[PDB]
Amino acid sequence: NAKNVTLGVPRLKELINISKKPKTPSLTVFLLGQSARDAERA
DNA sequence: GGCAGTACTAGTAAAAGTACTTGAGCTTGATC
RNA sequence: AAGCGAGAAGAACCAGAAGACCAGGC
DNA sequence: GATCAAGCTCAAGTACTTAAGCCTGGTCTATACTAGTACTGCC
Numbered sequence: 136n137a138k139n140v141t142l143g144v145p146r147l148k149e150l151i152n153i154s155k156k157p158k159t160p161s162l163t164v165f166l167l168g169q170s171a172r173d174a175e176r177a
Numbered sequence: 178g179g180c181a182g183t184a185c186t187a188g189t190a191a192a193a194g195t196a197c198t199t200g201a202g203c204t205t206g207a208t209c
Numbered sequence: 210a211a212g213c214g215a216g217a218a219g220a221a222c223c224a225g226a227a228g229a230c231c232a233g234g235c
Numbered sequence: 236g237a238t239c240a241a242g243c244t245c246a247a248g249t250a251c252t253t254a255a256g257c258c259t260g261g262t263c264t265a266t267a268c269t270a271g272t273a274c275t276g277c278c
Contacts, residue, residue, distance in 0.1 A: 178278105179277105179278090180276105180277085180278080181275100181276095181277080181278090182274100182275085182276080182277085183273100183274085183275080183276090184272100184273090184274080184275100185271105185272080185273080185274090186270105186271085186272070186273095187269090187270085187271080187272085188268105188269080188270080188271090189267100189268085189269070189270090190266090190267075190268070190269080192253105192254090193252105193253095193254100194251105194252095194253100195250105195251090195252095196249105196250090196251090197248105197249090197250090197251105198247105198248090198249085198250105199246105199247095199248090199249105200245105200246095200247090200248105201244105201245090201246090201247105202243105202244090202245085202246105203242100203243085203244080203245095204241100204242085204243080204244095205240105205241090205242085205243100206239100206240090206241090206242100207238105207239090207240085207241100208237105208238095208239090208240105209236105209237100209238100
């Protein structure tokens with residue numbers, strides 16, 4: 136076995152069994168301009 | 178020594194995941 | 210260099226469970 | 236032009252396969268009813 140992310144043997148198992156529903160599927164969204172710099176637009 | 182009675186041997190009796198199939202609802206066309 | 214009695218072989222001659230369950234080390 | 240029937244697609248439900256390695260000891264192993272099978276007293 137801030138936020139919770141699947142890691143270790145479970146995560147490796149999901150990666151190699153190419154599961155459809157990951158236990159903790161997430162998105163690393165990256166901002167472009169001012170939204171990226173300031174926090175109000177973000 | 179034969180008949181019937183009886184005990185023994187036998188012989189039969191508090192898993193999880195993925196894939197496939199079926200049913201229902203949509204999509205399209207044909208007919209009156 | 211030593212040197213003071215004799216020998217030779219008849220017959221024939223290893224063993225399986227397997228299965229289940231439990232405990233235990235790593 | 237509208238309705239009905241047929242075909243196609245999607246979602247849900249049910250069934251089938253895998254669960255680390257090797258290594259050491261121990262104990263335990265079908266009733267149950269049955270017909271025949273012989274013995275053995277009883278007469």
